[PDB]
mmCIF file of C-alpha atoms in Angstrom:
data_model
loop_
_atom_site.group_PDB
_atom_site.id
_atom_site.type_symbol
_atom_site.label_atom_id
_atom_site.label_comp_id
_atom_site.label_asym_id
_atom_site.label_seq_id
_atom_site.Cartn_x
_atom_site.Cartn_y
_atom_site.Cartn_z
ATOM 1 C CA UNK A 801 117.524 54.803 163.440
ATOM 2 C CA UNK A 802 119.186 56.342 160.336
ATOM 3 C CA UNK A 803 119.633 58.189 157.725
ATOM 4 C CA UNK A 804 121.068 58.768 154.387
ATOM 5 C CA UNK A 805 120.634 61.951 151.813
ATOM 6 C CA UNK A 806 121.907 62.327 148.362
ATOM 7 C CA UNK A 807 124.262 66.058 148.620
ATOM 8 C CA UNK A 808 124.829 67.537 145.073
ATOM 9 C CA UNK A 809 127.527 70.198 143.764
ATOM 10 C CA UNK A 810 125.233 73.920 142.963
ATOM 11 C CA UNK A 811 127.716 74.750 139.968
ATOM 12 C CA UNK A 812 130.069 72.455 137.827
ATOM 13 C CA UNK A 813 132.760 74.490 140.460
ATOM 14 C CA UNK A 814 131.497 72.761 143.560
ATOM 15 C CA UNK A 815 131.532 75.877 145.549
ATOM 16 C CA UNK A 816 129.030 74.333 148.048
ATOM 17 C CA UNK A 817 126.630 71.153 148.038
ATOM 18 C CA UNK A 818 123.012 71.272 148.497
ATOM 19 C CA UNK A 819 121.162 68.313 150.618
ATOM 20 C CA UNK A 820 117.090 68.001 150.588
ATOM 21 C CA UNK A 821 115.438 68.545 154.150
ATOM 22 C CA UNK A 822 111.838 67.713 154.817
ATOM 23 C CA UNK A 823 110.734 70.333 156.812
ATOM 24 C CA UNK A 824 107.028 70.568 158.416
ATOM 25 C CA UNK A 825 103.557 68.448 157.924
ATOM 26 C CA UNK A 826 102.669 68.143 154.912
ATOM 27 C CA UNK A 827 106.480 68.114 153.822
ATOM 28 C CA UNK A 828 108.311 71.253 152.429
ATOM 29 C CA UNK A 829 111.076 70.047 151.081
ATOM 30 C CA UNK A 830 113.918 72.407 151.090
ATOM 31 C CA UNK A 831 117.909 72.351 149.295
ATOM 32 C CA UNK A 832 119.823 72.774 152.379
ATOM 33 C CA UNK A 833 123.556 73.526 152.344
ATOM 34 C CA UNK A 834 125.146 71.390 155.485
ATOM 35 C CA UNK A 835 127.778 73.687 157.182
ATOM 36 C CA UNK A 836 129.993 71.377 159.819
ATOM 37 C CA UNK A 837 131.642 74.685 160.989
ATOM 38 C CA UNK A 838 128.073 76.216 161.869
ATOM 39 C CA UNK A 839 125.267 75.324 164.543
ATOM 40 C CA UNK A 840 122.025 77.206 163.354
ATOM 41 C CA UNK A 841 119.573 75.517 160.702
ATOM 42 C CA UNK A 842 118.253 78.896 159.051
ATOM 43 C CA UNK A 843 115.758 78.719 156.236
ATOM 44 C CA UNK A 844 114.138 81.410 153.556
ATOM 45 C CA UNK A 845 110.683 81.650 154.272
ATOM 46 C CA UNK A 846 107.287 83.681 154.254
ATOM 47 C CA UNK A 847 109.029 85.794 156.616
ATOM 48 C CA UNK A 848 112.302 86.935 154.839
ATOM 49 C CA UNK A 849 112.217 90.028 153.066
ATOM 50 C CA UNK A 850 110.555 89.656 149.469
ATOM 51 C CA UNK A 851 113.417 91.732 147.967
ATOM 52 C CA UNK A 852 116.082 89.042 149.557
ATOM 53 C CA UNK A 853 114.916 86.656 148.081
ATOM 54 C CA UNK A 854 115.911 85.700 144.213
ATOM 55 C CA UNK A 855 114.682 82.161 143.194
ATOM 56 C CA UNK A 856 114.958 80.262 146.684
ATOM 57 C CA UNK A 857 112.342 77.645 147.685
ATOM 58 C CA UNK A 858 110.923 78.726 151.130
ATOM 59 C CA UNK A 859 109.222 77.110 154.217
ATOM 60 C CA UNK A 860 105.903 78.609 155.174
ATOM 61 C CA UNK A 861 104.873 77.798 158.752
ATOM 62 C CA UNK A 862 101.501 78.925 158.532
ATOM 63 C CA UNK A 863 101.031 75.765 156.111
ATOM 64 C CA UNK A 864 102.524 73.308 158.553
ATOM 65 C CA UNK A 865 100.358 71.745 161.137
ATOM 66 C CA UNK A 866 103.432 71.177 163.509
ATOM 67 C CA UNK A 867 104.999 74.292 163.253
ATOM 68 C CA UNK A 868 105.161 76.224 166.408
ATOM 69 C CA UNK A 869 106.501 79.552 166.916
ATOM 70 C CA UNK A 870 109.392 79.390 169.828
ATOM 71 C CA UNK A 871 108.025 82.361 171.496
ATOM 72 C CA UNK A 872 110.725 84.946 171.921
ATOM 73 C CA UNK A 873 113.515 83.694 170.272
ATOM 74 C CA UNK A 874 115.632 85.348 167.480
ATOM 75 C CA UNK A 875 118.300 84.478 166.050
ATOM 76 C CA UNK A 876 121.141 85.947 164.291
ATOM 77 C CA UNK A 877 124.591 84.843 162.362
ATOM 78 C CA UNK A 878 127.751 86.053 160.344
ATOM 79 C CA UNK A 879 129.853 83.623 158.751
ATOM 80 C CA UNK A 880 133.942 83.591 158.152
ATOM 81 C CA UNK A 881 132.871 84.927 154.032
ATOM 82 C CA UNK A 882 131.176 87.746 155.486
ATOM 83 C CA UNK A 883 127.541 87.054 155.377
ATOM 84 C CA UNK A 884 125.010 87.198 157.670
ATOM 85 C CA UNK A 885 121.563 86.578 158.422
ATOM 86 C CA UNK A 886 118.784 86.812 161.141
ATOM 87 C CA UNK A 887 115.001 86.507 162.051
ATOM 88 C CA UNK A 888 112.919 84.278 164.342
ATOM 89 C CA UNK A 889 112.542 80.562 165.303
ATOM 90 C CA UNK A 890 110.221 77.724 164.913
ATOM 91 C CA UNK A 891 109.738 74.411 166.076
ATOM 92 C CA UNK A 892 108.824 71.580 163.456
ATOM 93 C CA UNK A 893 109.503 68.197 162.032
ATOM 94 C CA UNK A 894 112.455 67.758 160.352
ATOM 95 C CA UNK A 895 113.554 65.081 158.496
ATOM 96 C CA UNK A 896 116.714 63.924 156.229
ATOM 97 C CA UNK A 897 117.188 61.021 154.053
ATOM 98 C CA UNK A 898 114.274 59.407 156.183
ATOM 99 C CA UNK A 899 116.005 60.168 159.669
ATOM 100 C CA UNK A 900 112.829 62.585 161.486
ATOM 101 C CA UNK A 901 113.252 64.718 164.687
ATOM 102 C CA UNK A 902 110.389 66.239 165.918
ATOM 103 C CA UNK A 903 110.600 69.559 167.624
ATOM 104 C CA UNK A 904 113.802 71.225 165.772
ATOM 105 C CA UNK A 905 114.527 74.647 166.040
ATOM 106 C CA UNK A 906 114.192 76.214 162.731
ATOM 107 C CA UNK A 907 114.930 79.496 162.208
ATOM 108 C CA UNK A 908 113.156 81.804 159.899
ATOM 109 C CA UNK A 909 114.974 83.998 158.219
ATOM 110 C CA UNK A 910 113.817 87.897 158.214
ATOM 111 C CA UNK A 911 116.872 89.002 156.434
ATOM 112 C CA UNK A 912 119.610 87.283 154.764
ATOM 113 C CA UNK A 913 122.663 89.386 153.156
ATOM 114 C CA UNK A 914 123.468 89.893 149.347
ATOM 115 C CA UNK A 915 125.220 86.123 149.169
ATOM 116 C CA UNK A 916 122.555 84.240 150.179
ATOM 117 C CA UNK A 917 120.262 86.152 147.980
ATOM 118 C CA UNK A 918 122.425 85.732 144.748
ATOM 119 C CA UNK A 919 122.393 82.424 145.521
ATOM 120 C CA UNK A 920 118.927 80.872 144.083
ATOM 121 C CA UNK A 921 120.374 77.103 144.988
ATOM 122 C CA UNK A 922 120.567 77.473 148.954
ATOM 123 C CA UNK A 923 117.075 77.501 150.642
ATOM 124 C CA UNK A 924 119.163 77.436 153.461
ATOM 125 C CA UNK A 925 121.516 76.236 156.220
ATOM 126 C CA UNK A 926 122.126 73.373 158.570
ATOM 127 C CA UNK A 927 124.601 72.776 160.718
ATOM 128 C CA UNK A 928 126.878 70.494 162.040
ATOM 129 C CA UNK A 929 129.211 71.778 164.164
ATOM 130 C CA UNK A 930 128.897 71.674 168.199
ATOM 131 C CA UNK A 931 125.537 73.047 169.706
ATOM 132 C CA UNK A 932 127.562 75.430 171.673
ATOM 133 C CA UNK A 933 127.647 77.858 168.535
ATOM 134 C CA UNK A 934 124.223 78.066 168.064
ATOM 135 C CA UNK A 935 122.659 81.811 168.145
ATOM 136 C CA UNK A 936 119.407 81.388 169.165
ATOM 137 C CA UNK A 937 118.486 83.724 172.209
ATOM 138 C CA UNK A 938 117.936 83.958 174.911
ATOM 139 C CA UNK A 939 117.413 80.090 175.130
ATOM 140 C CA UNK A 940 120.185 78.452 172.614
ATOM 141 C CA UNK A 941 119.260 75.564 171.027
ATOM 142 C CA UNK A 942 120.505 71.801 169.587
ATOM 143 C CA UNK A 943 121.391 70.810 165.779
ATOM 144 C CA UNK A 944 119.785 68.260 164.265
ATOM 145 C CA UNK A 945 122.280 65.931 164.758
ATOM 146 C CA UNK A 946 122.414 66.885 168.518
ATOM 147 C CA UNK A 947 118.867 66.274 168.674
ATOM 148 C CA UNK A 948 118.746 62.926 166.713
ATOM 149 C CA UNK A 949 121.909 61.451 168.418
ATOM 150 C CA UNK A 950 120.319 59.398 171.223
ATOM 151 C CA UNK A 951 118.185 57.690 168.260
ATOM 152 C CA UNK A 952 120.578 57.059 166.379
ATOM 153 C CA UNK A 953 122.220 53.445 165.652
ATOM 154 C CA UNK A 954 125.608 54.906 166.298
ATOM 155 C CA UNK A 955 126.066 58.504 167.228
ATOM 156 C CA UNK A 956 127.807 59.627 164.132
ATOM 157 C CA UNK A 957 127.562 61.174 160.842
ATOM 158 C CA UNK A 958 129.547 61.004 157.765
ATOM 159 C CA UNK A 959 130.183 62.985 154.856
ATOM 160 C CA UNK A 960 130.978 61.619 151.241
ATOM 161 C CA UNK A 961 131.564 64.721 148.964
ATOM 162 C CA UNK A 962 131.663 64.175 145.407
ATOM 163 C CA UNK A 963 134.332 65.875 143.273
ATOM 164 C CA UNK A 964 132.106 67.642 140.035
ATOM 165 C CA UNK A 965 129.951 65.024 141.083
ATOM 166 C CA UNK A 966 126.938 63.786 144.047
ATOM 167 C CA UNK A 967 127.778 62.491 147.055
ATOM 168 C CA UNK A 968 126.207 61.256 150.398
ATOM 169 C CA UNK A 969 125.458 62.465 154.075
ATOM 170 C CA UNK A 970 124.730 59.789 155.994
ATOM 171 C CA UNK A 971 123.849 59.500 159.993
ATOM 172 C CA UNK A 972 123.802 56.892 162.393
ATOM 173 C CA UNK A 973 126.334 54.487 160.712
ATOM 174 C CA UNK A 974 129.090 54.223 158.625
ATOM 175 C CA UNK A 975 129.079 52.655 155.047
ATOM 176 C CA UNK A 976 131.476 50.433 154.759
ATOM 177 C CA UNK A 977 131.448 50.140 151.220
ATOM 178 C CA UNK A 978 132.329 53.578 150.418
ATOM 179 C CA UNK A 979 135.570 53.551 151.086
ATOM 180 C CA UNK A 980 138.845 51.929 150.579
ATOM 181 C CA UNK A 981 141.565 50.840 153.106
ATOM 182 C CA UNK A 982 140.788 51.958 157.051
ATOM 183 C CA UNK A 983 139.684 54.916 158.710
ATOM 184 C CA UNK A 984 141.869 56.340 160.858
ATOM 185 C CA UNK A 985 140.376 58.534 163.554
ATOM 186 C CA UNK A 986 141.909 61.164 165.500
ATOM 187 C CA UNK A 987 141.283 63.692 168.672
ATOM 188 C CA UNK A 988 138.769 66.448 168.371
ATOM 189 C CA UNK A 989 138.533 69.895 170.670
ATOM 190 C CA UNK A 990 135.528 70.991 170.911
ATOM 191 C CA UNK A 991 136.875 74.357 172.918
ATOM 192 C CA UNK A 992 136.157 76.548 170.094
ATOM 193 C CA UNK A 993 132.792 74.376 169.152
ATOM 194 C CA UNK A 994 133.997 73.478 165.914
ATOM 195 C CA UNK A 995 134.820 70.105 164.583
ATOM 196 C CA UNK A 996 138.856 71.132 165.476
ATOM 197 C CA UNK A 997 141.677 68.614 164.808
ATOM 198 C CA UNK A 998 145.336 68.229 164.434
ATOM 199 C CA UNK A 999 146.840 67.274 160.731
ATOM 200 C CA UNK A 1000 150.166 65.672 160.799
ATOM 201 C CA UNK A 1001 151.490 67.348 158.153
ATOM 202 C CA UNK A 1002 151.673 67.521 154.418
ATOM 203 C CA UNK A 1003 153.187 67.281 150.996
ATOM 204 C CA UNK A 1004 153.494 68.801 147.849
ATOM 205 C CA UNK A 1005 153.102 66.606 144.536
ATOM 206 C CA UNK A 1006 155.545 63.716 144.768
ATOM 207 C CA UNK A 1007 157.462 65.308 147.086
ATOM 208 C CA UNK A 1008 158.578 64.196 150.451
ATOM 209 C CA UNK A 1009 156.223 64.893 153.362
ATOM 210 C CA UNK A 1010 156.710 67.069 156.106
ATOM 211 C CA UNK A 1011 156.055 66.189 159.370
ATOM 212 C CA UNK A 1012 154.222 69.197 160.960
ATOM 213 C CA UNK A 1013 151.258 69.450 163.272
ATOM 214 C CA UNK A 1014 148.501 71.958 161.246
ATOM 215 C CA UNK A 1015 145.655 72.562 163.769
ATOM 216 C CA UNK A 1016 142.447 73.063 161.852
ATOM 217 C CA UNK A 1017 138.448 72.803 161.511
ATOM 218 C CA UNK A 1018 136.876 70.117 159.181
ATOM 219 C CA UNK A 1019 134.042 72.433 157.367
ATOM 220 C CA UNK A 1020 131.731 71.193 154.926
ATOM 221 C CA UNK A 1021 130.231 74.849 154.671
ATOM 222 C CA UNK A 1022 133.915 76.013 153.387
ATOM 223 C CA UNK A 1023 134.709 75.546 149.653
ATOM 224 C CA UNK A 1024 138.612 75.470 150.086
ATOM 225 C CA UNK A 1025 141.474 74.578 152.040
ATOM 226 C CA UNK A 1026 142.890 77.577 154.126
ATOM 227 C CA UNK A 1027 146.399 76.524 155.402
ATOM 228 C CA UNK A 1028 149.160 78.127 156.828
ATOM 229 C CA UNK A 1029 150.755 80.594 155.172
ATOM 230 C CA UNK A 1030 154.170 78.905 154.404
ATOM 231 C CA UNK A 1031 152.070 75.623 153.652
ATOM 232 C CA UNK A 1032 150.195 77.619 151.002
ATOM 233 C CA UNK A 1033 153.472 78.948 149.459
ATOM 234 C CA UNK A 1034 155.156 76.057 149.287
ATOM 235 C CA UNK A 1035 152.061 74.546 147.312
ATOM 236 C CA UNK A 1036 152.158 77.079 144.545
ATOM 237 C CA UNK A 1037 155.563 77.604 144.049
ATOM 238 C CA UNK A 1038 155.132 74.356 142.278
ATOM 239 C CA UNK A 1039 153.328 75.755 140.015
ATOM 240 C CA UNK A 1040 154.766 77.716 137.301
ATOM 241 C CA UNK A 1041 153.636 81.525 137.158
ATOM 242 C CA UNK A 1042 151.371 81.235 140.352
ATOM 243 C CA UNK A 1043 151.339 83.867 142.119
ATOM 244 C CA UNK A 1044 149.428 85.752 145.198
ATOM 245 C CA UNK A 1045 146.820 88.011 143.789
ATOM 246 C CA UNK A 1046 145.757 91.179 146.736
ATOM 247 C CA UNK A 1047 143.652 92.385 143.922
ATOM 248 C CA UNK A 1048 142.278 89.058 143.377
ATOM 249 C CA UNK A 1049 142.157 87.940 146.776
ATOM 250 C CA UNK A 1050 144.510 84.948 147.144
ATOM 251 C CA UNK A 1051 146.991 82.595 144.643
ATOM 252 C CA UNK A 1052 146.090 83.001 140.742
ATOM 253 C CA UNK A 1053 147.863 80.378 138.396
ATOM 254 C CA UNK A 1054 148.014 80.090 134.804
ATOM 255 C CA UNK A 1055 145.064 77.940 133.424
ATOM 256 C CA UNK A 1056 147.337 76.347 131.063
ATOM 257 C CA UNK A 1057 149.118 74.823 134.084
ATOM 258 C CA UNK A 1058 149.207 71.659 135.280
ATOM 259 C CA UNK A 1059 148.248 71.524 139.118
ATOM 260 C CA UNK A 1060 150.226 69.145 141.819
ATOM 261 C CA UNK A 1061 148.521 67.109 144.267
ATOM 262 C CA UNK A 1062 148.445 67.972 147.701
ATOM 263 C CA UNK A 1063 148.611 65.319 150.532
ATOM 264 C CA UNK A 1064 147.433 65.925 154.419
ATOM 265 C CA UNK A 1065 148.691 63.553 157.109
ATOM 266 C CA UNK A 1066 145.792 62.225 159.362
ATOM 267 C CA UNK A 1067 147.716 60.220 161.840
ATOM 268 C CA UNK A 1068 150.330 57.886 159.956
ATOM 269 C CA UNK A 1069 147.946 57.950 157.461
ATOM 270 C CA UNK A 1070 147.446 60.181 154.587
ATOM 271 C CA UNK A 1071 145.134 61.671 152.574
ATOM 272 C CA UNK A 1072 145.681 62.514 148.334
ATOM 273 C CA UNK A 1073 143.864 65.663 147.044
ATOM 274 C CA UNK A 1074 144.653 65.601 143.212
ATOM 275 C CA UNK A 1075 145.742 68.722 141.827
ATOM 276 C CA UNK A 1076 142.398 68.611 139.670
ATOM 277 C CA UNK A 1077 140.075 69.557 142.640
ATOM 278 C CA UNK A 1078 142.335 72.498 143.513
ATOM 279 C CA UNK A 1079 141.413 74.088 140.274
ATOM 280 C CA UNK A 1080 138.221 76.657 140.544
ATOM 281 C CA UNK A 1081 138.625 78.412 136.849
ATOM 282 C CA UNK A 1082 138.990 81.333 135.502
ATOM 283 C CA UNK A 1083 138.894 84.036 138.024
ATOM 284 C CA UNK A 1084 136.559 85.945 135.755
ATOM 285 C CA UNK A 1085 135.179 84.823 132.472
ATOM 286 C CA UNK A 1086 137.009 84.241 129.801
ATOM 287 C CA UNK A 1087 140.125 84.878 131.894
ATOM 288 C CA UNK A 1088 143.501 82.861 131.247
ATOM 289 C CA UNK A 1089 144.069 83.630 135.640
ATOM 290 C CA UNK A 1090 142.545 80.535 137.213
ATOM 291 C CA UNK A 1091 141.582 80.503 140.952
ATOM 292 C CA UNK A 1092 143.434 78.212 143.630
ATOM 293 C CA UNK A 1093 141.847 75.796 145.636
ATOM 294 C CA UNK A 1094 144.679 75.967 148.355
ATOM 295 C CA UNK A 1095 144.490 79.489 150.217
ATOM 296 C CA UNK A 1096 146.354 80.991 152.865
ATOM 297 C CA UNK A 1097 144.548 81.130 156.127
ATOM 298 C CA UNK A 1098 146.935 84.031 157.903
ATOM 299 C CA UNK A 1099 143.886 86.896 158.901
ATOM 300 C CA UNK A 1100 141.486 83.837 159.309
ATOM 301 C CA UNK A 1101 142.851 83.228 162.318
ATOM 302 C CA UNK A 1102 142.301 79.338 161.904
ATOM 303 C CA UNK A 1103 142.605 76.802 159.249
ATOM 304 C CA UNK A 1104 140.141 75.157 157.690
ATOM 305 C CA UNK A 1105 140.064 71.967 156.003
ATOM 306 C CA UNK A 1106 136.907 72.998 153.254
ATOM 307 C CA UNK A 1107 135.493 70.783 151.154
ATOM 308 C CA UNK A 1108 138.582 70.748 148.472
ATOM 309 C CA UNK A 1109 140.227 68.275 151.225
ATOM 310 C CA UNK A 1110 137.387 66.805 152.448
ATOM 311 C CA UNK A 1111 136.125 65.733 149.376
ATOM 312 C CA UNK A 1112 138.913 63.860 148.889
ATOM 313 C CA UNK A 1113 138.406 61.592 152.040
ATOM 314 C CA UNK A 1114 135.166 59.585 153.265
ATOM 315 C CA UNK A 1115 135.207 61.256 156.723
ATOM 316 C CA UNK A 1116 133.172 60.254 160.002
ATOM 317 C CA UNK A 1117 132.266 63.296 162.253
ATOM 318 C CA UNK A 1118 131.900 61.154 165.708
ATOM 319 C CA UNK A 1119 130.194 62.460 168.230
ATOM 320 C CA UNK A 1120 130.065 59.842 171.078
ATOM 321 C CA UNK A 1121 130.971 60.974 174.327
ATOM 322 C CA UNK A 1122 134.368 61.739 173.408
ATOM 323 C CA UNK A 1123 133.763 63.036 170.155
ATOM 324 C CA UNK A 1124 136.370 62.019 167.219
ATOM 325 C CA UNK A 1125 136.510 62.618 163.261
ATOM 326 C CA UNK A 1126 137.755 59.669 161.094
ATOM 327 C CA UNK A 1127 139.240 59.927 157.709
ATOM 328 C CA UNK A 1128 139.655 57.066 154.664
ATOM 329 C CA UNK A 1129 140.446 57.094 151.522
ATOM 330 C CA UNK A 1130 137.771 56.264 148.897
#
């Protein structure tokens, strides 16, 4: 089997991509926000506190004839931005972009922090990374992936993230038509249960490229890139007037300016972010300060490749035995 969803940006800033789920019999269909560096499929619902919620779409189990409540489980989850949630678990059918599992773990959310609230465009969660981060207790349970790997044509799934612009999850085979050149894959740890790999360096602009190994996470769930903090320097003092912001919270830059590409070595290979996706506006509105799209990850205490790189490559997450992640231009 497989299966193949259209993901779309929430705001013309493409701080995070929604991607419809059927959940349940008849269908709910829900705008799901699929998180590679997170292992729990969370939903709003009947359940979560009216005053939490703010414009979501929820799942009802009562109205599904194969939802089953997974008797004793709860779940509960904070992510790297701060936010949280929590609640109970469900079992149901679950299907994206025609690809169905039956019996997922779906966890009802009793409480969801300020974030998710303010956030009317995210029903929800699902994630990607390795079942070993999941917090369902006392019995842990798989991702949807996990779950519909053995089904699948080829146990994989890739990600195709549009810049200002749709894009496409697919699973169970690779598209060979939405990209250009090859895809060159390279090794994944799974210690920390995140899609973890090794970059092989990077440059600034035009400029010459440094070989350097830059151990980070590919996360879909993360809007921007979080490198080292001599990485991130080097970036922006390419920019004239950019400059690190505590009271903003990371690099500021003149809107007027003109932003450099970045490049990130995958293998030999390479991969071109243009400087345009590394712009995210005005810090408030109306402001001449524009947010940067490169951060420093020192205080993260890892670095993640967000979707401001990622949505620069067609990338395979590869989880056969030995699991992999593949990255091509497009």
């Amino acid at each position: 089997s497989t299966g193949s969803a259209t993901t779309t940006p929430i705001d013309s800033l493409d701080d995070a991509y929604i991607t419809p789920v059927q959940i349940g019999t008849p269908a709910q269909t829900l705008n799901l926000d699929f998180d590679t560096g997170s292992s729990d499929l969370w939903v709003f619902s009947s359940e979560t506190t009216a005053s939490e919620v703010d414009g979501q779409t929820i799942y009802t189990p009562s109205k599904s004839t194969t939802a089953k409540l997974l008797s004793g489980a709860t779940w509960s989850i904070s992510y790297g931005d701060g936010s949280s949630s929590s609640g109970d678990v469900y079992t149901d059918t679950v299907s994206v972009g025609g690809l169905t599992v039956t019996g997922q773990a779906v966890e009802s959310a009793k409480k969801v922090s300020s974030s998710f609230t303010e956030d009317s465009t995210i029903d929800g969660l699902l994630g990607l990374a390795f079942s070993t981060l999941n917090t369902v207790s006392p019995t842990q349970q798989k991702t949807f992936f996990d779950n519909a790997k053995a089904s699948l044509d080829s146990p994989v799934f890739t990600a195709d993230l549009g810049y200002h612009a749709p894009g496409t999850y697919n699973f169970g085979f690779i598209d060979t038509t939405a990209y250009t050149g090859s895809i060159t894959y390279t090794a994944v740890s799974t210690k920390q249960g995140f899609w973890e790999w090794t970059s092989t360096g990077y440059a600034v602009g035009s400029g010459t490229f440094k070989s350097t190994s830059i151990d980070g996470i590919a996360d879909t769930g993360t809007t921007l890139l979080y490198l080292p903090a001599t990485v991130v320097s080097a970036y922006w003092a390419q920019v004239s007037g950019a400059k690190s912001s505590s009271s903003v919270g990371g690099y500021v830059f003149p809107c007027s300016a003109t932003l450099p590409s970045f490049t990130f070595g995958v293998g030999s290979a390479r991969i071109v972010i243009p400087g345009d996706y590394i712009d995210f506006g005005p810090i408030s509105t109306g402001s001449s300060s524009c947010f940067g799209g490169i951060q420093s990850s020192a205080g993260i205490g890892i670095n993640i490749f967000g979707d401001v790189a990622l949505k620069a490559a067609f990338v395979v997450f590869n989880g056969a035995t030995t699991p992999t992640l593949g990255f091509a231009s497009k």
